[PDB]
Amino acid sequence: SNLYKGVYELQSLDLNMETLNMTMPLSCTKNNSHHYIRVGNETGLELTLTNTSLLDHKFCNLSDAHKKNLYDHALMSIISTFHLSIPNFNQYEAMSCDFNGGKITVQYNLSHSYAGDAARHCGTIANGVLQTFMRMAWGGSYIALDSGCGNWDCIMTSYQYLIIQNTTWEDHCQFSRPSPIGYLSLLSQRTRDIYIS
Amino acid sequence: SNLYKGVYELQSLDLNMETLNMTMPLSCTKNNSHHYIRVGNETGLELTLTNTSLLDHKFCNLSDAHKKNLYDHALMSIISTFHLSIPNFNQYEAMSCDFNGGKITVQYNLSHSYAGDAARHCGTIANGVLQTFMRMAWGGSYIALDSGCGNWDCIMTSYQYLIIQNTTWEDHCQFSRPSPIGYLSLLSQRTRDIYIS
Amino acid sequence: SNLYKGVYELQSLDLNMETLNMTMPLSCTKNNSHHYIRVGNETGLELTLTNTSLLDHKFCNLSDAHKKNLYDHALMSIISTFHLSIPNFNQYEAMSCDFNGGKITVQYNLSHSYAGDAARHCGTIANGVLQTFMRMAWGGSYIALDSGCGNWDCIMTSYQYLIIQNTTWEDHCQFSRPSPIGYLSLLSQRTRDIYIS
Amino acid sequence: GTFTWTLSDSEGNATPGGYCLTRWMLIEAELKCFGNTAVAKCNEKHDEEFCDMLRLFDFNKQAISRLRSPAQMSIQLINKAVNALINDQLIMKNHLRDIMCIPYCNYSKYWYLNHTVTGRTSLPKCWLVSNGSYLNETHFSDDIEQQADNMITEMLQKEYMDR
Amino acid sequence: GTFTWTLSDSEGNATPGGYCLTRWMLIEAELKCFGNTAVAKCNEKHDEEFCDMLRLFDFNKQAISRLRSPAQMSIQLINKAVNALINDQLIMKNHLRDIMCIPYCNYSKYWYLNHTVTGRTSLPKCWLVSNGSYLNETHFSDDIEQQADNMITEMLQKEYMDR
Amino acid sequence: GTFTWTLSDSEGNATPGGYCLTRWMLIEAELKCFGNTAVAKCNEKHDEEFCDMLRLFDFNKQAISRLRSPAQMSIQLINKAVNALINDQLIMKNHLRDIMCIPYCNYSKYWYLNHTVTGRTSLPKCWLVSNGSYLNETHFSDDIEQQADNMITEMLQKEYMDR
Ligand SMILES: *[C@@H]1O[C@H](CO)[C@@H](O[C@@H]2O[C@H](CO)[C@@H](O[C@@H]3O[C@H](CO[C@H]4O[C@H](CO)[C@@H](O)[C@H](O)[C@@H]4O)[C@@H](O)[C@H](O[C@H]4O[C@H](CO)[C@@H](O)[C@H](O)[C@@H]4O)[C@@H]3O)[C@H](O)[C@H]2NC(C)=O)[C@H](O)[C@H]1NC(C)=O
Ligand SMILES: *[C@@H]1O[C@H](CO)[C@@H](O[C@@H]2O[C@H](CO)[C@@H](O[C@@H]3O[C@H](CO[C@H]4O[C@H](CO)[C@@H](O)[C@H](O)[C@@H]4O)[C@@H](O)[C@H](O[C@H]4O[C@H](CO)[C@@H](O)[C@H](O)[C@@H]4O)[C@@H]3O)[C@H](O)[C@H]2NC(C)=O)[C@H](O)[C@H]1NC(C)=O
Ligand SMILES: *[C@@H]1O[C@H](CO)[C@@H](O[C@@H]2O[C@H](CO)[C@@H](O[C@@H]3O[C@H](CO[C@H]4O[C@H](CO)[C@@H](O)[C@H](O)[C@@H]4O)[C@@H](O)[C@H](O[C@H]4O[C@H](CO)[C@@H](O)[C@H](O)[C@@H]4O)[C@@H]3O)[C@H](O)[C@H]2NC(C)=O)[C@H](O)[C@H]1NC(C)=O
Ligand SMILES: *[C@@H]1O[C@H](CO)[C@@H](O[C@@H]2O[C@H](CO)[C@@H](O[C@@H]3O[C@H](CO)[C@@H](O)[C@H](O)[C@@H]3O)[C@H](O)[C@H]2NC(C)=O)[C@H](O)[C@H]1NC(C)=O
Ligand SMILES: *[C@@H]1O[C@H](CO)[C@@H](O[C@@H]2O[C@H](CO)[C@@H](O[C@@H]3O[C@H](CO)[C@@H](O)[C@H](O)[C@@H]3O)[C@H](O)[C@H]2NC(C)=O)[C@H](O)[C@H]1NC(C)=O
Ligand SMILES: *[C@@H]1O[C@H](CO)[C@@H](O[C@@H]2O[C@H](CO)[C@@H](O[C@@H]3O[C@H](CO)[C@@H](O)[C@H](O)[C@@H]3O)[C@H](O)[C@H]2NC(C)=O)[C@H](O)[C@H]1NC(C)=O
Ligand SMILES: *[C@@H]1O[C@H](CO[C@@H]2O[C@@H](C)[C@@H](O)[C@@H](O)[C@@H]2O)[C@@H](O[C@@H]2O[C@H](CO)[C@@H](O)[C@H](O)[C@H]2NC(C)=O)[C@H](O)[C@H]1NC(C)=O
Ligand SMILES: *[C@@H]1O[C@H](CO[C@@H]2O[C@@H](C)[C@@H](O)[C@@H](O)[C@@H]2O)[C@@H](O[C@@H]2O[C@H](CO)[C@@H](O)[C@H](O)[C@H]2NC(C)=O)[C@H](O)[C@H]1NC(C)=O
Ligand SMILES: *[C@@H]1O[C@H](CO[C@@H]2O[C@@H](C)[C@@H](O)[C@@H](O)[C@@H]2O)[C@@H](O[C@@H]2O[C@H](CO)[C@@H](O)[C@H](O)[C@H]2NC(C)=O)[C@H](O)[C@H]1NC(C)=O
Ligand SMILES: *[C@@H]1O[C@H](CO)[C@@H](O[C@@H]2O[C@H](CO)[C@@H](O)[C@H](O)[C@H]2NC(C)=O)[C@H](O)[C@H]1NC(C)=O
Ligand SMILES: *[C@@H]1O[C@H](CO)[C@@H](O[C@@H]2O[C@H](CO)[C@@H](O)[C@H](O)[C@H]2NC(C)=O)[C@H](O)[C@H]1NC(C)=O
Ligand SMILES: *[C@@H]1O[C@H](CO)[C@@H](O[C@@H]2O[C@H](CO)[C@@H](O)[C@H](O)[C@H]2NC(C)=O)[C@H](O)[C@H]1NC(C)=O
Ligand SMILES: *[C@@H]1O[C@H](CO)[C@@H](O[C@@H]2O[C@H](CO)[C@@H](O)[C@H](O)[C@H]2NC(C)=O)[C@H](O)[C@H]1NC(C)=O
Ligand SMILES: *[C@@H]1O[C@H](CO)[C@@H](O[C@@H]2O[C@H](CO)[C@@H](O)[C@H](O)[C@H]2NC(C)=O)[C@H](O)[C@H]1NC(C)=O
Ligand SMILES: *[C@@H]1O[C@H](CO)[C@@H](O[C@@H]2O[C@H](CO)[C@@H](O)[C@H](O)[C@H]2NC(C)=O)[C@H](O)[C@H]1NC(C)=O
Ligand SMILES: *[C@@H]1O[C@H](CO)[C@@H](O[C@@H]2O[C@H](CO)[C@@H](O)[C@H](O)[C@H]2NC(C)=O)[C@H](O)[C@H]1NC(C)=O
Ligand SMILES: *[C@@H]1O[C@H](CO)[C@@H](O[C@@H]2O[C@H](CO)[C@@H](O)[C@H](O)[C@H]2NC(C)=O)[C@H](O)[C@H]1NC(C)=O
């Protein structure tokens, strides 16, 4: 449109959010099944959407993680923030975790929609997980299996598991630019949306 | 007073909050012992203040409600929001619930003020329940047994039970206009006021 | 500097926050090891930083405190607010409490940094306690063993215990003026900083 | 004509001289139209019961129109929306006033000054209740007079050449 | 003369030229009176340590006068009141500054510019502390000069005919 | 030249005509400098994606410079800082818009009007995205025109003698 009721240019900006890396986590998208969180120098989390499973335990050994420690700080805070932002989740077998050398490895088991095709539509804990996932990383989360706007909740995707693991900070942010906003959105307010009791 | 330092009229408005019915709950007052919450098309909750009792169980079967499901969504969220907005309540027998066909039926047992006349003045869980009740529905809550302003907390009313059940949405809002504000007040901030630990 | 681009004086104020005593708690500093909270007429809490121990129980008898009652209201709310503002604390033996005539007496056991010298640097629950302590009372908290700014968290002080007890309201606020701000800071937002699960 | 208080991408009602409250916003009659320069106050004031209701209605319209929302009202969307929309601090101030015997807003009734000579309005402000009912304009008093002063000021500052 | 920052229903001290801080608000002397047009800034600024203390005192007065509050201070009323009254965001900014070695407000001391020729004031702003004590006016410096510019502007915009 | 949006004690960049965004704030080139009277809007507006990013960068600079933060990023400091810095309400509004198919800000891209004749700028405002990508200026449209009106107004009110 050039000028706007006088001589004015738009002169746009694109912020280098990467330089915020040393103080708060930055999330991004790599491809359809992978999202990442940078938490410090050469370190961060890998968020994987898959149909396979790594952890067959039904226990989440938090009593060890918070007593024996031996875990990475900050990465633990991020996963706890994420986990506790999910509505209506208790455990229900899903969300088991193993810190005995696998450290932060935790998995959500989205398959608990049960049956097949949309199953527990608008009720599955899987949607609670997906909605939290899409806040942890957002904007660039649209290429995940969540598809279509104006369709809030009741997503019912085809991936069976969400697996979260610690990784190195390689140049993973190929689909979307890194941003502190996802983490800040989960952290800020939360909205509680407890359901339970 | 007519005009105000020039020619001005007051021209008042009265908002039709009912049209907000399809997106968020609306609470109102029917009469001294009854308050209601609309949650959707032809559906909502009935809040009853009484001296009788329907549920003689001392169990609140939430482990079934959140595992077997078979419950109405939204209505469950409203009661959980309400319940968790009460300060200092644990269970203390009171607040048992039965979802085995009675669905949302829950009751608070305000009689746990003990003794008679004002008893555990400024300490009973009943006041925690009454104060939460008067936020769930407010403005028109003044005809409930809570009586006198400038007397915060230490209400000590004569009803023995608060019973919450699912109802149909009949034209219940005879004493006060429906409003989203009560729910929003409980939801927003909460103030925590935990007491426990 | 006298006048400021015209004739202006600075005319400073110093607020008498003490007159706020009858509605909300006021915290202050007495000396290096002692801080206080006023909660009402001739009553408040004593916060002691020491190397001795009064309570050798490893139990925090809250199940009695919130069931048998027999405890002071408001003082209980303040300690619960304080306690629940500490990040990552579970119990870990520390934070036992005894209300059987000792009423609010609770102690935090800062010695769980383990070893000696800075030990579990940036990880001890003791720092969680110290940071909460320095919000309960602040500004004048600098003479406590926390020393040096620009060194956030990882404080690792030399006191072994934080003991909180009910006292009379004597003229304790000798080092700093009483202020509602400490309590308000803990109460407001909290920041959650849960860590656990 | 765009607003910051709206969730819509300037979809409408920000340009035709003002924003109109329709018969489904109002219980009585229709089209109470507030000039855009008045409505725009809701863009930044951050403390007004009327503006807070206005945002809540704007949400409702968008949520119904775009989501349909059969069966459930998506209470979980609301939980997100309130943190985005409702000015929690004000709600609690009105709550305290009820506790304290101080006239407070229960959000149903509003008043405004209408300069019927020209048709300009001040925007609605809450009428307030106490002791179970509405206040008289005779005790409400001075706040009306103060609102008139503000409109007077606007009409003088309205001069384009200066002021 | 009405305020939005007050909980009262315009009970008083909004009309007699200004709002006075009494000897129970102040440790020293009495009646530090701030003109109503200055005080009114607390109605909408939404970020000022002085205004936040002002609301807290207003609450205290109403709570004691109307509730009596024998035995207990109704800490639960306070929990409601703070969400209504205290500007949490500002409190945390001052907290961070303490952590960070940046001068911060501990809320006890305020300064203002007093144009003693006419008696107008800027309203108090926090004096700030660092390294365990109060700052010198010589390092505080420019912020005073900037506040003076604001008062100068007001005195020129005070002209009724225009500006 | 001091700001309220900054955590620093007026350490710098509030006085040399404006605040500059450096090459580590920007991905492209360097020194996008916004005049102080424009930047100052972030002191009180309380609702702007650009200003919120500006505070977040200011924090980052102070946190790194003063704390060093080896090994850990002190996520717990961040939890305190966000309550102090990020305007939660706005973040949720952009979140709702994504849910609702309404163009929303993902915070990476901003636009402003640059009156290159004189060099004045409006400050950045978020460009917005929808359907996975950025909007055209042709649909963005009127909001630009409205921003131009605001700059026009400022240039006329800039007159020192009056207005
Ligand atoms: C807010 O929303 C916007 C809109 O979707 C997001 O913008 C995208 O951001 C990603 C990541 O920065 C960009 O991805 C890049 O795509 C390039 C493809 O090249 C073709 O398309 C571009 C489009 O502009 C043409 O200019 C070009 O000529 C080609 O036709 C890749 O080549 C890029 O690779 C390089 O960077 C990566 C970074 O990790 C390196 O690993 C590579 O080795 C290489 O150096 C890159 O993949 C995408 O193009 C942007 N889209 C648009 C429309 O601008 C924002 O990121 C989002 N913001 C936030 C914070 O979430
Ligand atoms: C904020 O606070 C105000 C003040 O208390 C509340 O206002 C009341 O709202 C209720 C519900 O809308 C009104 O109740 C009605 O009372 C009528 C009684 O008629 C006599 O009194 C009126 C008083 O104005 C005279 O005009 C009339 O001539 C009579 O002398 C009933 O006839 C009404 O019944 C009709 O509506 C109900 C709605 O459910 C239908 O079921 C009935 O079949 C019938 O059609 C009704 O009961 C009350 O009068 C209002 N009081 C005042 C002073 O205005 C606000 O509701 C409250 N706002 C919120 C959101 O909480
Ligand atoms: C914000 O931060 C400031 C700066 O640190 C704190 O200000 C201090 O507040 C304390 C408590 O009010 C003051 O303590 C007093 O010190 C006196 C020492 O006297 C010498 O030093 C003063 C310094 O001004 C000289 O004027 C004097 O001539 C001497 O050389 C004591 O004599 C005082 O004792 C009296 O008051 C106590 C109150 O409990 C009584 O018990 C005693 O019996 C006696 O009557 C008192 O101990 C301290 O001086 C202040 N420092 C400064 C630099 O001003 C703020 O309190 C803090 N605000 C908040 C809310 O936290
Ligand atoms: C603020 O004051 C103005 C001026 O009084 C109000 O405008 C007036 O509103 C009424 C009712 O909507 C209009 O009456 C119309 O009468 C015809 C028949 O004559 C009928 O067919 C229409 O349906 C309608 O009832 C009246 O013409 C209109 N006045 C002017 C000059 O246009 C305004 O409604 C008041 N407040 C607000 C917030 O709008
Ligand atoms: C802002 O500056 C003005 C002007 O200096 C201050 O007003 C002045 O305040 C003093 C102290 O309250 C008044 O002194 C009085 O003296 C008589 C005896 O002469 C005594 O009986 C009174 O009790 C009082 O001490 C002084 O008269 C008054 N000046 C004027 C012109 O009225 C003002 O207090 C300063 N700041 C604020 C916030 O009020
Ligand atoms: C708002 O518009 C003004 C006016 O166009 C922009 O100022 C201009 O910015 C460019 C790029 O920084 C300057 O170019 C310089 O060219 C010399 C060689 O001729 C080179 O050595 C420098 O490194 C630089 O590239 C240009 O001189 C400058 N114009 C003026 C009159 O000073 C401004 O950058 C735009 N927006 C913002 C937010 O700053
Ligand atoms: C992770 O989830 C699987 C369930 O995965 C799918 O969905 C189920 C509803 C069912 O149709 C499975 O066949 C699908 O593969 C858990 O495995 C089964 O869980 C069901 C109860 O829902 C149980 O009856 C089966 O016996 C389980 N399978 C076996 C071989 O025993 C799996 O245990 C979950 N793992 C964790 C750690 O939570
Ligand atoms: C609901 O509450 C009643 C208590 O109701 C009243 O208040 C009591 C303090 C006592 O004075 C009762 O007589 C009054 O009717 C519970 O019933 C009794 O509870 C007390 C302990 O408080 C116990 O000693 C009695 O034995 C109980 N009554 C009988 C017949 O056993 C009742 O159990 C509560 N129900 C639920 C579901 O919580
Ligand atoms: C309060 O803490 C002490 C621990 O205090 C110090 O730090 C320990 C790491 C150790 O070095 C002690 O010697 C120091 O005095 C608890 O007492 C001991 O706890 C350790 C486990 O950490 C255990 O092995 C010892 O046997 C305990 N001491 C004795 C005599 O049994 C003490 O129990 C804690 N008290 C409460 C109520 O929590
Ligand atoms: C993971 O495996 C399941 C089967 O166990 C796949 O489920 C369905 O597959 C058909 C055929 O591809 C689709 O048309 C259905 O829509 C799928 N179910 C759902 C709920 O969408 C599932 O597609 C596999 N997931 C992925 C991502 O490959
Ligand atoms: C996730 O964290 C673990 C724990 O630090 C990493 O595994 C360690 O790698 C170092 C490499 O020098 C070894 O010395 C340690 O013995 C390993 N620890 C354990 C428990 O095996 C792991 O590599 C990290 N994941 C990624 C992808 O970097
Ligand atoms: C509020 O209105 C309801 C419904 O009209 C009243 O409840 C009924 O009262 C009649 C009285 O003869 C009983 O026969 C019905 O069995 C009651 N029905 C239900 C569902 O309880 C209620 O009593 C009224 N309350 C007040 C204070 O007047
Ligand atoms: C429910 O039953 C109890 C008795 O078990 C009634 O308690 C008292 O009744 C007397 C006489 O009516 C009143 O003057 C007292 O004030 C009542 N107690 C309290 C705490 O107020 C009680 O009134 C009955 N409740 C209702 C609403 O009928
Ligand atoms: C509260 O909810 C229950 C559960 O839906 C309602 O009871 C059902 O009513 C339908 C009517 O067609 C029957 O077909 C179902 O079999 C009933 N379910 C059960 C568990 O009995 C109940 O009517 C609702 N309460 C009110 C007042 O509407
Ligand atoms: C802070 O002041 C208190 C009270 O004056 C000091 O506590 C007393 O110290 C004397 C020293 O001879 C003991 O005999 C008392 O038994 C102590 N009383 C109590 C209740 O502890 C305290 O030691 C002072 N702290 C500092 C750092 O000086
Ligand atoms: C409490 O006792 C412990 C020993 O059990 C003291 O620990 C160290 O003491 C030496 C010598 O005074 C110091 O130089 C060390 O710095 C202390 N440890 C730590 C973590 O700082 C401890 O000083 C005693 N505490 C007090 C306040 O007296
Ligand atoms: C902390 O609270 C307890 C409980 O009230 C106080 O102890 C009581 O003191 C009165 C004094 O008249 C005695 O009659 C009570 O019998 C005591 N109660 C118990 C359980 O022993 C104690 O004094 C308070 N602490 C301080 C320092 O005041």
Tab-separated table of C-alpha atoms in Angstrom, chain B residues 5-171:
chain	number	residue	atom	x	y	z
B	5	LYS	CA	-25.175	21.067	33.892
B	6	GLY	CA	-26.420	21.165	30.340
B	7	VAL	CA	-29.046	19.145	28.708
B	8	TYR	CA	-28.380	15.565	29.581
B	9	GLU	CA	-30.589	12.585	30.276
B	10	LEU	CA	-29.620	9.447	32.291
B	11	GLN	CA	-31.201	7.041	29.770
B	12	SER	CA	-30.490	3.828	31.718
B	13	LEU	CA	-29.739	0.320	30.412
B	14	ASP	CA	-30.579	-3.132	31.802
B	15	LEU	CA	-28.473	-5.885	30.217
B	16	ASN	CA	-29.938	-9.094	28.919
B	17	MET	CA	-27.378	-11.420	30.401
B	18	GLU	CA	-29.506	-14.406	29.415
B	19	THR	CA	-28.133	-14.251	25.875
B	20	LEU	CA	-24.743	-15.278	27.316
B	21	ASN	CA	-26.396	-18.746	28.218
B	22	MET	CA	-24.651	-20.731	25.386
B	23	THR	CA	-21.112	-19.902	26.385
B	24	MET	CA	-20.768	-19.558	30.184
B	25	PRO	CA	-22.892	-20.467	33.241
B	26	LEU	CA	-25.423	-18.019	34.614
B	27	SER	CA	-26.505	-18.051	38.227
B	28	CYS	CA	-29.724	-16.615	39.813
B	29	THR	CA	-32.065	-16.710	42.789
B	30	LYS	CA	-35.551	-18.271	42.712
B	31	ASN	CA	-36.619	-17.798	46.399
B	32	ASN	CA	-35.046	-17.846	49.952
B	33	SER	CA	-34.012	-21.499	49.828
B	34	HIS	CA	-33.263	-21.910	46.142
B	35	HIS	CA	-30.638	-20.740	43.720
B	36	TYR	CA	-29.907	-21.952	40.191
B	37	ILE	CA	-27.131	-22.164	37.579
B	38	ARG	CA	-27.894	-22.409	33.844
B	39	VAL	CA	-25.204	-24.319	31.967
B	40	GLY	CA	-26.667	-24.942	28.536
B	41	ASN	CA	-29.849	-25.438	26.477
B	42	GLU	CA	-32.593	-26.601	28.899
B	43	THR	CA	-30.029	-27.606	31.550
B	44	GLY	CA	-28.447	-26.398	34.799
B	45	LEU	CA	-27.892	-26.881	38.554
B	46	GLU	CA	-30.208	-26.547	41.481
B	47	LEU	CA	-28.691	-25.247	44.695
B	48	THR	CA	-30.912	-26.096	47.645
B	49	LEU	CA	-30.713	-24.846	51.187
B	50	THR	CA	-32.597	-27.177	53.439
B	51	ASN	CA	-32.994	-28.923	56.853
B	52	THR	CA	-33.462	-32.422	55.251
B	53	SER	CA	-30.933	-34.796	53.785
B	54	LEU	CA	-30.875	-36.934	50.683
B	55	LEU	CA	-27.477	-38.508	50.792
B	56	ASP	CA	-26.513	-40.446	53.925
B	57	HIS	CA	-23.235	-41.680	52.530
B	58	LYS	CA	-20.018	-40.359	53.961
B	59	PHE	CA	-18.115	-41.169	50.835
B	60	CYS	CA	-17.585	-38.829	47.861
B	61	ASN	CA	-17.163	-41.239	45.004
B	62	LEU	CA	-14.896	-39.060	42.823
B	63	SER	CA	-12.613	-41.971	42.140
B	64	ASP	CA	-15.499	-43.418	40.183
B	65	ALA	CA	-16.623	-40.142	38.720
B	66	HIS	CA	-13.286	-39.354	37.229
B	67	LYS	CA	-12.482	-42.909	36.119
B	68	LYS	CA	-15.734	-44.455	34.928
B	69	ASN	CA	-16.869	-41.064	33.764
B	70	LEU	CA	-20.577	-41.371	32.982
B	71	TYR	CA	-20.990	-37.779	34.139
B	72	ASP	CA	-21.985	-34.536	32.606
B	73	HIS	CA	-19.172	-32.340	31.513
B	74	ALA	CA	-19.304	-28.660	32.460
B	75	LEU	CA	-21.631	-29.479	35.331
B	76	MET	CA	-18.718	-31.372	36.834
B	77	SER	CA	-16.382	-28.451	36.247
B	78	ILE	CA	-18.737	-26.050	37.936
B	79	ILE	CA	-19.095	-28.179	41.009
B	80	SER	CA	-15.375	-28.764	41.220
B	81	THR	CA	-14.782	-25.016	40.894
B	82	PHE	CA	-17.319	-24.396	43.618
B	83	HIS	CA	-16.060	-27.091	45.904
B	84	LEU	CA	-12.454	-26.122	45.636
B	85	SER	CA	-13.280	-22.470	46.359
B	86	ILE	CA	-14.305	-23.377	49.891
B	87	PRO	CA	-11.553	-22.613	52.482
B	88	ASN	CA	-10.476	-25.130	55.166
B	89	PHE	CA	-12.823	-27.983	54.231
B	90	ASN	CA	-11.042	-31.363	53.861
B	91	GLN	CA	-14.074	-33.624	54.116
B	92	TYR	CA	-15.032	-34.090	57.778
B	93	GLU	CA	-17.797	-36.555	56.661
B	94	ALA	CA	-19.664	-33.642	55.051
B	95	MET	CA	-19.495	-33.149	51.257
B	96	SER	CA	-20.169	-36.742	50.455
B	97	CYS	CA	-21.381	-37.361	46.828
B	98	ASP	CA	-23.101	-40.080	44.831
B	99	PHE	CA	-22.853	-40.346	41.068
B	100	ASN	CA	-24.429	-43.786	40.766
B	101	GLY	CA	-27.470	-42.483	38.916
B	102	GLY	CA	-27.830	-39.435	41.204
B	103	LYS	CA	-25.087	-37.974	39.097
B	104	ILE	CA	-23.909	-34.677	40.430
B	105	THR	CA	-25.821	-34.938	43.746
B	106	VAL	CA	-23.490	-33.682	46.501
B	107	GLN	CA	-24.243	-32.280	49.925
B	108	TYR	CA	-22.339	-29.993	52.271
B	109	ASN	CA	-23.923	-30.633	55.774
B	110	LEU	CA	-23.863	-27.013	57.241
B	111	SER	CA	-24.947	-28.552	60.543
B	112	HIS	CA	-21.216	-29.038	61.314
B	113	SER	CA	-21.215	-25.801	63.303
B	114	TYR	CA	-22.062	-28.265	66.041
B	115	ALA	CA	-23.968	-27.621	69.301
B	116	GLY	CA	-26.656	-25.046	68.514
B	117	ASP	CA	-27.158	-21.271	68.356
B	118	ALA	CA	-23.974	-19.780	67.042
B	119	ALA	CA	-21.595	-22.593	67.918
B	120	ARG	CA	-18.184	-22.692	66.226
B	121	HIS	CA	-18.480	-19.024	65.530
B	122	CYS	CA	-15.844	-17.792	62.990
B	123	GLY	CA	-14.504	-21.363	62.664
B	124	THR	CA	-17.092	-23.715	61.162
B	125	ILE	CA	-16.586	-25.159	57.703
B	126	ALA	CA	-20.213	-24.249	57.213
B	127	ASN	CA	-19.239	-20.624	56.906
B	128	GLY	CA	-16.667	-21.579	54.331
B	129	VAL	CA	-19.526	-23.251	52.443
B	130	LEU	CA	-21.886	-20.309	52.875
B	131	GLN	CA	-19.331	-17.821	51.682
B	132	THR	CA	-18.615	-19.888	48.648
B	133	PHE	CA	-22.388	-20.288	48.066
B	134	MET	CA	-22.817	-16.538	48.128
B	135	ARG	CA	-20.178	-16.096	45.459
B	136	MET	CA	-21.651	-18.822	43.210
B	137	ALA	CA	-24.753	-16.714	43.167
B	138	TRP	CA	-24.568	-13.264	44.614
B	139	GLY	CA	-26.421	-9.957	44.693
B	140	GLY	CA	-29.679	-11.921	45.047
B	141	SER	CA	-28.101	-14.198	47.655
B	142	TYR	CA	-29.120	-11.784	50.426
B	143	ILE	CA	-32.463	-13.503	50.934
B	144	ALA	CA	-30.659	-16.685	51.893
B	145	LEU	CA	-30.129	-17.104	55.585
B	146	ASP	CA	-27.020	-14.985	55.534
B	147	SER	CA	-28.272	-11.784	57.086
B	148	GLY	CA	-26.628	-8.467	57.805
B	149	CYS	CA	-23.734	-6.681	56.006
B	150	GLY	CA	-20.652	-5.413	57.778
B	151	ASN	CA	-20.546	-8.832	59.422
B	152	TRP	CA	-17.983	-10.654	57.445
B	153	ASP	CA	-17.694	-14.382	57.869
B	154	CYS	CA	-19.034	-15.911	61.165
B	155	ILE	CA	-22.446	-16.148	59.512
B	156	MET	CA	-23.711	-19.235	61.358
B	157	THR	CA	-27.032	-19.826	59.523
B	158	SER	CA	-29.979	-22.056	60.478
B	159	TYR	CA	-30.040	-24.341	57.377
B	160	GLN	CA	-28.390	-27.652	57.967
B	161	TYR	CA	-27.607	-28.714	54.438
B	162	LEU	CA	-26.574	-27.365	51.055
B	163	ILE	CA	-27.559	-29.784	48.378
B	164	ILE	CA	-26.458	-29.491	44.803
B	165	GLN	CA	-28.247	-31.438	42.055
B	166	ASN	CA	-28.690	-31.386	38.209
B	167	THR	CA	-32.062	-29.980	36.983
B	168	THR	CA	-33.818	-28.909	33.862
B	169	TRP	CA	-33.732	-25.306	32.875
B	170	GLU	CA	-37.146	-24.119	33.729
B	171	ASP	CA	-37.892	-20.464	34.371
